[PDB]
């Protein structure tokens, strides 16, 4: 997001990078988060 | 159809060769030796295609400003790039170039003046 | 269960098939061929590349200095790109 | 003292390839419609093909102005073939000229008369040798003196390649003689 | 039996061409005649320029400009070469030989150059 | 249409020299003219093709050779066309082939 | 399952057809080629080992308990190809008889090679006569399956 | 009462479908290209093989993609502690719950 | 690096009118992403000729050392890839024949015998050279002959060779015609080209090779042969 900014960042695709990034760090803080899916592990269980 | 592109092409390239003078469709068979294109084909590319085409200008019976909207003036257009506080707001190399001479000899002057070039 | 041909039949056919007739159309053309390709400009308003060369059987480069010296392209919003040669 | 053990056995040049660039353009349908030992296909191949009894040969002609002349049996008759072929390209009307003529490639073979050992020389060459019985049937040897490719069959004949000087061949095989000898059945 | 032929081919083209008269406008007369006609018709130098040193390579042209001898119009179907030697597989054709004339539906074929 | 080649052919030669003095005599037309050799290639490859059936062996030297336009070219010398029911013998041969 | 099911899922409804996108941008005359695949018979072998050679052999169910393997079966079924071209023609069918997978046998089951041999033979292959069997065994475990 | 016929027999069909859209995607992909078919070389023999070895295996259900949590531990490794361990497990019954 | 994500819950996750519930899953490994493709190739055709896992790993391990010397990039990857799996049979002692690689590969023999030599020069390593006896074991499984008769062969290709009757010869034609001789005098005749199906080789060359051994046919065999079939009526072609 950052090179991205930096180069051509268009609009709709910073607002899913941010959105994206919202997700993430959320889901590292809580994963568990009732009304949206789950960061999981590679196997398919849940991410601790 | 390829024809009348082989014509703007020609007429693009004559306008660069210094030939800015006003001719008509007729005129431009002869010199190519193509009047036998048909005189319905003749006539549709005459009074549909090349009055529809914006790069010409129709006077009286003939057609001006040649390739497209042009001022030609020996590519010489110092005022114009000068153009007071307005600066031409940008000219393009590729205009240049199409307008008569090769742009490099100019611009290299134009380095020299107060021009600026950027690889937009 | 699958016996050992030293090649598959069928590419061996692809191979007899390709060792007939090549898409390697010679170019000391250029005038013809495009006399043709506004032909082509003449059944329909644009075409896609892919289709372009298809129906010109050659070497994609000349062309694309051609549709380069005198055509120009399109992105209709599909992704691919689609060409026009209207001098216009 | 002889440099080998039974010395040479004459090593006979069997094949020569050569360039040579004739300076101008030409137009090889022209050519091909004027020439009468010769063959065109632009759907094939772009350069024009021709073929003389002398010295029985074979040419390669590009439209950029290089030839190349393979199948003589020695340089000084490829430099003759190719001076032969601009004669034919002058004689068409075209501006031929003999320029920066060069041997590419020079092939070779000659025989020793006696069965050998192969699996014996690639365990003790393994380095350099690569034989593959299933593939190819001979043995593929890679020297790196006048850097040159063998092919060594279990009859004994022997063909070398990548020769630009006879020499080269006659030291490659100077090398590679005592070897094959001591690997006689 | 190929005169037959001859005479096969006179029938079609008479037949096939009668239509186009027509859009002419041209007299079925005119068709006839022209049959009949027809008819009656088929019976050391360092030195990076001179060359001159190598003149003669080349033969009489001369073979080509005459033409005389008997002639052979055809179809190939494969064209194959081993060094001097060459082999042919040919099809349709027509052949004429001392005046005569022959057809071949295929033929198969190996010269030496 | 098709290999033309058969326009070279004595029998397409006399085809456009009866076409020609329909010409001279002005009763067809030339674009007429044309169209008759387009029904007679036709014709003739038709009748080549689905009528002839006899073939021929052949032997020789080669004496020249030319391939240009998808057309082959050769000339052989001291040719030996043999058949099961046919021999002949000839010193010289001009062959064009196409495909 | 072996007798009924298998067989009758591999018959029952995926016959599959396919086609090219031919006459693209031009094209005509004829053909824009079709393939269609059915499938039939199905051969289930009794269970076997491949050595690293790629020699296969008959495998004893405890020697699949001692190396680790997994006492299964190869499967193989009838395959058809069906070339109806839009129009030059409409046969060109070709019969195959081809490996599929492998299918773990639970043990003295019918297709288990042990059911067909009697108490002197099975205490010769050194296998319980007084085993139950009805167990899968997979890379070296006895693995049963839970109603 | 699903035994191993009703449970193989919805796990074989996972795999055969999957199977199936390997040689459908194997084939399309041929086409596009064309005129170089083989049949042998579309099937995956490992995904019918290693898709139910697996679920026998470890325990779980279905070819991981579709969940495996609703048949978890309907497999198992055979406990043997006496003769009659052996035949209880074998003769096993188990029953769903929260 | 990162892990995946997908499938939620019941869902907010914005499909505001769209029906695309959050956001699709990103790739990550795009520049690699062609050799884990080459592992997919690898384990489907291995699985084809029944190959031991540690082949494949083994496999695995001689092409990521060629791919990452990129000394032969533009070559077919599948080729690249069948070939390391030629060397790594060779190198694990279990030869296996180019024709049985193109049985399983979309890669003719032309290209993997190309790539198999241009990637022992590049990667500076050589296998074995292949021996008659590497072979013996699995044809005579895929004949169904019995212990005895499989032995009787190897005897017979080791004779063989050991009396350089027909040298230069592939040792695929020499164990075929081997192999041949040993069912003609048992019980278990096979035919030409039944053999010739399952070897690969042609069965003319195969016929060939046998018109080759038979005139020293007796002193070939094993002493512990039970001649089914007699070497005075052993059949001849």
């Given at each position: 997001?950052?090179?991205?900014?930096?180069?051509?960042?268009?609009?709709?695709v910073?607002?899913?990078?941010?959105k994206?990034?919202?997700?993430?760090?959320?889901?590292?803080?809580?994963?568990?988060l009732?009304g949206?899916?789950?960061?999981?592990?590679?196997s398919?269980?849940?991410?601790? | 159809?390829?024809?009348?592109?082989?014509?703007?092409?020609?007429?693009?390239?004559?306008?660069?060769?210094?030939?800015?003078?006003?001719?008509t469709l007729?005129?431009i068979?002869?010199?190519?030796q193509?009047?036998?294109?048909?005189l319905?084909?003749?006539?549709?590319?005459?009074t549909?295609?090349?009055?529809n085409?914006?790069?010409?200008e129709?006077?009286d019976?003939?057609?001006?400003?040649?390739?497209?909207?042009?001022?030609?003036?020996?590519?010489?257009l110092?005022?114009l790039?000068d153009?007071?506080?307005?600066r031409?707001?940008?000219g393009?190399?590729?205009?240049?170039?199409?307008?008569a001479?090769?742009?490099?000899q100019?611009?290299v002057?134009?380095?020299?003046?107060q021009?600026?070039?950027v690889?937009? | 269960?699958n016996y050992?041909?030293?090649?598959?039949?069928?590419?061996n056919?692809?191979?007899?098939?390709?060792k007939?007739?090549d898409?390697?159309?010679?170019?000391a053309?250029?005038?013809?061929?495009?006399?043709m390709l506004?032909?082509?400009?003449?059944?329909?308003?644009?075409y896609?590349?892919?289709?372009?060369?298809?129906?010109?059987?050659?070497?994609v480069?000349y062309?694309?200095?051609?549709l380069?010296?005198?055509?120009?392209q399109?992105?209709?919003?599909?992704?691919?790109?689609?060409?026009?040669?209207?001098?216009? | 003292?002889?440099?080998?053990?039974?010395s040479g056995?004459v090593?006979?040049?069997?094949?020569?390839?050569?360039?040579?660039?004739?300076?101008?353009?030409?137009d090889?349908?022209?050519?091909?419609?004027?020439?009468?030992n010769a063959?065109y296909?632009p759907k094939?191949?772009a350069?024009?093909?021709?073929?003389?009894?002398?010295?029985?040969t074979?040419?390669?002609?590009?439209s950029?102005?290089?030839?190349?002349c393979?199948?003589?049996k020695?340089?000084?008759?490829?430099?003759?073939?190719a001076?032969?072929?601009?004669?034919?390209?002058?004689?068409?009307?075209?501006p031929?000229?003999f320029?920066?003529?060069?041997?590419?490639?020079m092939?070779?073979?000659?025989?020793?008369?006696?069965?050998?050992?192969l699996?014996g020389?690639?365990?003790?060459?393994?380095?350099?040798?690569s034989?593959?019985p299933?593939?190819?049937?001979?043995?593929?040897?890679?020297?790196?003196?006048?850097?040159?490719?063998?092919?060594?069959?279990?009859?004994?004949?022997?063909?070398?390649?990548?020769?630009?000087?006879?020499?080269?061949?006659?030291?490659?095989?100077?090398?590679?003689?005592?070897?094959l000898?001591?690997?006689?059945? | 039996?190929?005169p037959?032929?001859?005479?096969?081919?006179?029938?079609?083209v008479?037949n096939?061409v009668?239509?186009?008269?027509?859009?002419?406008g041209?007299?079925?007369?005119?068709?006839m005649?022209?049959?009949?006609?027809w008819?009656?018709?088929?019976?050391?130098?360092?030195?990076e320029?001179p060359?001159?040193s190598?003149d003669d390579?080349?033969?009489?042209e001369?073979?080509?400009l005459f033409?005389?001898?008997?002639?052979?119009?055809?179809?190939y179907d494969?064209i194959?070469?081993?060094?001097?030697?060459?082999?042919?597989?040919?099809?349709?054709?027509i052949m004429?030989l001392?005046?005569?004339?022959?057809?071949?539906?295929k033929?198969?074929?190996?010269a030496?150059? | 249409?098709?290999?033309?080649?058969?326009?070279?052919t004595?029998?397409?030669?006399?085809?456009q020299?009866?076409?020609?003095?329909?010409i001279?005599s002005?009763?067809?037309?030339?674009?007429?003219?044309?169209?008759?050799?387009?029904?007679?290639d036709?014709?003739i490859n038709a009748?080549?093709?689905?009528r002839?059936?006899?073939?021929?062996?052949?032997?020789?030297?080669?004496?020249?050779?030319?391939?240009?336009?998808?057309?082959?070219?050769?000339?052989?010398?001291?040719?030996?066309?043999?058949?099961?029911?046919?021999?002949?013998?000839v010193?010289?041969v001009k062959?064009?082939?196409?495909? | 399952?072996?007798?009924?099911?298998?067989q009758?899922?591999?018959?029952?409804?995926?016959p599959?057809?396919?086609?090219a996108?031919?006459q693209?941008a031009?094209?005509?005359v004829?053909?824009?080629?079709?393939?269609?695949?059915?499938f039939?018979?199905?051969?289930?072998?009794?269970?076997?080992?491949?050595?690293?050679?790629?020699?296969?052999?008959?495998?004893?169910?405890?020697?699949?308990?001692?190396?680790n393997?997994?006492?299964?079966?190869?499967?193989?079924?009838?395959?058809?190809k069906?070339?109806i071209?839009?129009?030059?023609?409409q046969?060109q069918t070709?019969?195959?008889?081809?490996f599929?997978?492998?299918?773990?046998?639970?043990?003295?089951?019918?297709?288990?090679?042990?059911?067909?041999?009697?108490d002197?033979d099975?205490?010769?292959l050194?296998?319980?006569?007084?085993?139950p069997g009805?167990?899968?065994?997979?890379?070296?475990?006895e693995?049963?399956?839970?109603? | 009462?699903?035994?191993?016929?009703?449970?193989?027999?919805?796990l074989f069909?996972?795999?055969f479908?999957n199977?199936l859209?390997?040689?459908?995607?194997?084939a399309?992909k041929?086409?596009?290209?064309?005129?170089?078919?083989?049949?042998?070389?579309?099937?995956?023999?490992?995904?019918?093989?290693?898709?139910?070895?697996?679920?026998?295996?470890?325990?779980?259900?279905?070819?991981?993609?579709?969940?495996?949590?609703?048949?978890?531990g309907?497999?198992?490794?055979?406990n043997?502690?006496?003769f009659?361990?052996t035949?209880?497990?074998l003769?096993r019954?188990?029953?769903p719950?929260? | 690096?990162?892990?995946?994500?997908?499938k939620?819950?019941?869902a907010?996750?914005?499909?505001?009118?769209?029906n695309s519930?959050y956001?699709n899953?990103?790739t990550?490994?795009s520049?690699?992403?062609?050799m884990?493709?080459?592992?997919?190739?690898?384990?489907?055709?291995?699985?084809?000729?029944?190959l031991?896992?540690?082949?494949?790993?083994?496999?695995?391990?001689?092409?990521?050392?060629?791919?990452?010397?990129?000394?032969?990039?533009?070559?077919?990857?599948?080729?690249?890839?069948?070939?390391?799996?030629?060397?790594?049979?060779?190198?694990?002692?279990?030869?296996?024949?180019?024709?049985?690689?193109?049985?399983?590969?979309?890669?003719?023999?032309?290209?993997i015998?190309?790539?198999?030599?241009?990637?022992?020069?590049?990667?500076?390593?050589?296998?074995?050279?292949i021996?008659?006896?590497d072979?013996?074991?699995?044809?005579?499984?895929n004949?169904?002959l019995?212990?005895?008769v499989?032995?009787?062969?190897?005897?017979?290709?080791?004779?063989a060779?050991?009396?350089?009757?027909?040298?230069?010869?592939?040792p695929?034609?020499?164990?075929a015609?081997?192999?041949?001789?040993?069912?003609?005098?048992?019980?278990?005749?096979?035919?030409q080209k039944e053999?010739?199906?399952?070897?690969?080789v042609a069965?003319?060359?195969?016929?060939?090779?046998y018109?080759?051994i038979?005139?020293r046919?007796?002193?070939?065999?094993?002493?512990?042969?039970?001649?089914?079939?007699?070497?005075?009526?052993?059949?001849?072609?």
């Open positions: 997001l950052r090179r991205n900014e930096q180069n051509g960042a268009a609009a709709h910073i607002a899913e990078d941010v994206l990034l919202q997700f993430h760090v959320a889901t590292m803080v809580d994963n568990e009732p949206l899916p789950r960061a999981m592990q590679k398919g269980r849940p991410l601790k | 159809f390829g024809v009348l592109a082989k014509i703007v092409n020609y007429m693009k390239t004559r306008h660069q060769r210094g030939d800015t003078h006003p001719l007729d005129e068979l002869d010199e190519t193509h009047l036998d294109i048909g319905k084909q003749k006539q549709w590319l005459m549909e295609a090349l009055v085409n914006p790069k010409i129709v006077i019976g003939k057609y001006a400003f040649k390739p497209k909207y042009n001022v030609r003036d020996k590519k010489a110092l005022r790039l153009q007071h506080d307005q031409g707001l940008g393009i190399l590729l205009e240049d170039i199409e307008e001479l090769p742009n490099s100019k611009a002057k134009a380095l020299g003046d021009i600026l070039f690889n937009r | 269960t050992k041909p030293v090649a598959n039949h069928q590419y056919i692809e191979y007899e098939r390709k007939k007739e898409g390697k159309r010679a170019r053309d250029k005038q013809h061929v495009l006399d506004f032909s082509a400009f003449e059944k329909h308003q644009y896609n590349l892919k289709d372009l060369v298809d129906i010109t059987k050659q070497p480069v062309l694309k200095e051609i380069k010296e005198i055509g120009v399109n992105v209709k919003g599909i992704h691919k790109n689609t060409w026009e040669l209207k001098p216009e | 003292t002889p440099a080998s053990e039974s056995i090593p006979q040049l069997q094949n020569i390839v050569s360039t040579v660039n004739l300076g101008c353009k030409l090889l349908k022209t050519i091909a419609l004027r020439a009468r063959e296909n094939r191949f350069a024009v093909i021709m073929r003389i009894r002398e010295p029985r074979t040419a390669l002609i590009f950029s102005g290089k030839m190349v393979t199948g003589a020695s340089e000084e008759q490829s430099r003759l073939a001076r032969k072929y601009a004669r034919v390209v002058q004689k068409l009307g075209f031929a000229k320029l920066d003529f060069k041997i590419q490639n092939v070779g073979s000659c025989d020793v008369k006696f069965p050998i050992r699996e020389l690639v365990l003790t060459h393994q380095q350099f040798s034989y593959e299933e593939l190819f049937p001979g043995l593929i040897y890679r020297m790196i003196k006048p850097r040159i490719v063998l092919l060594i069959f279990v009859s004994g004949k022997v063909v070398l390649t990548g020769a630009k000087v006879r020499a080269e061949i006659y030291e490659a095989f100077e090398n590679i003689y005592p070897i000898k001591g690997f006689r059945k | 039996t190929v037959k032929l001859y005479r096969s081919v006179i029938e079609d008479i096939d009668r239509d186009i008269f027509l859009d002419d041209v007299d079925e007369q005119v068709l005649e022209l049959k009949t006609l008819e009656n018709k088929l019976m050391g130098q360092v030195e320029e060359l001159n190598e390579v080349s033969d009489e001369g073979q080509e033409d005389t001898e008997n002639v052979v119009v055809c179809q494969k194959h070469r081993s060094k001097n030697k060459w082999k042919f597989h040919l099809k349709d054709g004429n001392n005046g005569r004339d022959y057809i071949f539906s033929a198969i074929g190996d030496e150059w | 249409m098709a290999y033309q080649l058969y326009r070279n004595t029998l397409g030669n006399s085809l020299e009866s076409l020609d003095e329909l001279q002005q009763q067809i037309t030339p674009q007429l003219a044309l169209q008759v050799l387009l029904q007679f036709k014709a009748a080549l093709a689905q002839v059936r006899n073939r021929v062996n052949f032997r020789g030297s080669l004496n020249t050779y030319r391939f240009c336009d998808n057309v082959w070219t050769f000339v052989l010398n001291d040719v030996e066309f043999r058949e099961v029911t046919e021999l002949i013998k010193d010289k062959i064009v082939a196409c495909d | 399952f072996i007798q009924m099911s298998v009758r899922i591999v018959e029952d409804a995926p599959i057809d396919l086609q996108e031919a693209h031009s094209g005509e004829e053909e824009p080629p079709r393939y269609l695949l059915k039939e018979q199905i051969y289930l072998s009794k269970p076997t080992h491949w050595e690293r050679d790629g020699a296969p052999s008959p495998m004893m169910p405890n020697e699949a308990r001692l190396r393997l997994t006492y299964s079966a190869p499967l193989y079924v009838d395959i058809t069906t070339v071209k839009e129009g030059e023609e046969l070709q019969h195959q008889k081809t599929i997978g492998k299918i773990p046998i639970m043990l003295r089951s019918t297709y288990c090679l042990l059911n067909g041999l009697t002197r099975l205490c010769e050194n296998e319980c006569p007084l085993d009805g167990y899968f065994i997979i890379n070296g475990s693995k049963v399956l839970i109603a | 009462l699903d035994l191993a016929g009703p449970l193989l027999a919805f069909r996972g795999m479908k199977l859209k390997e040689v459908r995607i194997y399309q041929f086409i596009d290209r064309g005129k170089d078919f083989n049949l042998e070389l579309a099937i995956k023999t490992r995904i019918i093989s290693d898709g139910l070895k697996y679920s026998l295996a470890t325990g779980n259900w279905g070819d991981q993609k579709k969940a495996h949590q609703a048949r978890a309907v497999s198992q490794v055979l043997r502690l006496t009659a361990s035949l209880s497990h003769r019954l188990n029953s719950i929260g | 690096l990162s892990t995946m994500i997908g939620g819950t019941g907010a996750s914005f499909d505001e009118f769209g519930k956001q899953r990103r990550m490994s520049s690699d992403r062609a884990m493709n080459a592992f997919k190739e690898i384990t489907t055709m291995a699985d084809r000729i029944n031991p896992r540690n082949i494949v790993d083994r496999t695995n391990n001689l092409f990521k050392q060629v791919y990452e010397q990129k000394s032969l990039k533009g070559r077919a990857n599948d080729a690249i890839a069948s070939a390391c799996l030629y060397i790594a049979c060779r190198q694990e002692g279990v030869p296996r024949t180019f024709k049985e690689i193109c049985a399983v590969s979309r890669i003719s023999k032309k290209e015998g190309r790539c198999f030599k241009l990637i022992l020069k590049a990667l500076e390593t050589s296998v074995d050279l021996t008659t006896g072979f013996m074991s699995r044809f005579c499984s004949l169904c019995p212990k005895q499989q032995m009787a062969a190897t005897h017979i290709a080791r004779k060779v050991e009396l350089d009757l027909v040298p230069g010869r592939s695929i034609s020499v164990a015609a081997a192999i041949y001789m040993a069912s003609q005098a048992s019980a278990e005749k096979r035919t053999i010739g199906d399952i070897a690969g069965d003319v060359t195969i016929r060939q090779s018109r080759l038979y005139p046919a007796p002193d070939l065999f094993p002493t512990d042969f039970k001649f089914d079939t007699p070497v005075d009526k052993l059949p001849q072609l």
